[PDB]
Design a protein around this ligand. Structure first.
Ligand code: B9N
Ligand code: CA
Ligand code: CA
Ligand code: CA
Ligand code: ZN
Ligand code: ZN
Length: 159
């Protein structure tokens, strides 16, 4: 068990917004993605608009100031750092993707659920039904649900 947040109230901040989507749909997708994990743990997530948040959400392209460049359209979608100070927790989404609320392009909500998993300390699962499986695939977002493996993983860290 590597790093974990040692506190229940976690803050996030949207550094910048992708032009691919309506602003309120970015807010909603990110908020919903946090709720997925707060529904199975004692963690509480609050959006802040100024100051240092635990989890900074960034849309960036190519080389963006960390040692982990993005690759243009396709390939890598996003990445996140495990719990820690500074860049720890932060979630970066490749702006060269086309982010959406639906099945077109790459679904922001689903990607965010996977990346926040990493921000909370989760690795990857070998279970293709898990949100933490290392392969993106679209599933109807209105019906989405964590797998038993994802729940066991997060509860092993927090509950
Ligand atoms: C079920 O919903 C899901 C949604 C998204 C994903 C998902 C799958 C792949 C990526 S990915 O970006 O194609 C990817 C691919 C291979 C290894 C690692 C990754 C990234 C990290 C990329 C980096 O180091 O810069 C990751 O796992 O977070 C991102 C997100 C998986 C499942
Ligand atoms: Ca951080
Ligand atoms: Ca890419
Ligand atoms: Ca884009
Ligand atoms: Zn990055
Ligand atoms: Zn991953």
């Amino acid at each position: 068990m590597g790093p974990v947040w040692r506190k229940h109230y976690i803050t996030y901040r949207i550094n910048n917004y992708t032009p691919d989507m309506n602003r309120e749909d970015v807010d909603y997708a990110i908020r919903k993605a946090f709720q997925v994990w707060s529904n199975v743990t004692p963690l509480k997530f609050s959006k802040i608009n100024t100051g240092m948040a635990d989890i900074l959400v960034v849309f960036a392209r190519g080389a963006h100031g960390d040692d982990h460049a993005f690759d243009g359209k396709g390939g890598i979608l996003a990445h996140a750092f495990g719990p820690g100070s500074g860049i720890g927790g932060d979630a970066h989404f490749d702006e060269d993707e086309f982010w959406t609320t639906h099945s077109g392009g790459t679904n922001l909500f689903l990607t965010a659920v996977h990346e926040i998993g990493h921000s909370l300390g989760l690795g990857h699962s070998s279970d293709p039904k898990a949100v933490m499986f290392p392969t993106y695939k679209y599933v109807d977002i209105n019906t989405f649900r964590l797998s038993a493996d994802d729940i066991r993983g997060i509860q092993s860290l927090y509950g």
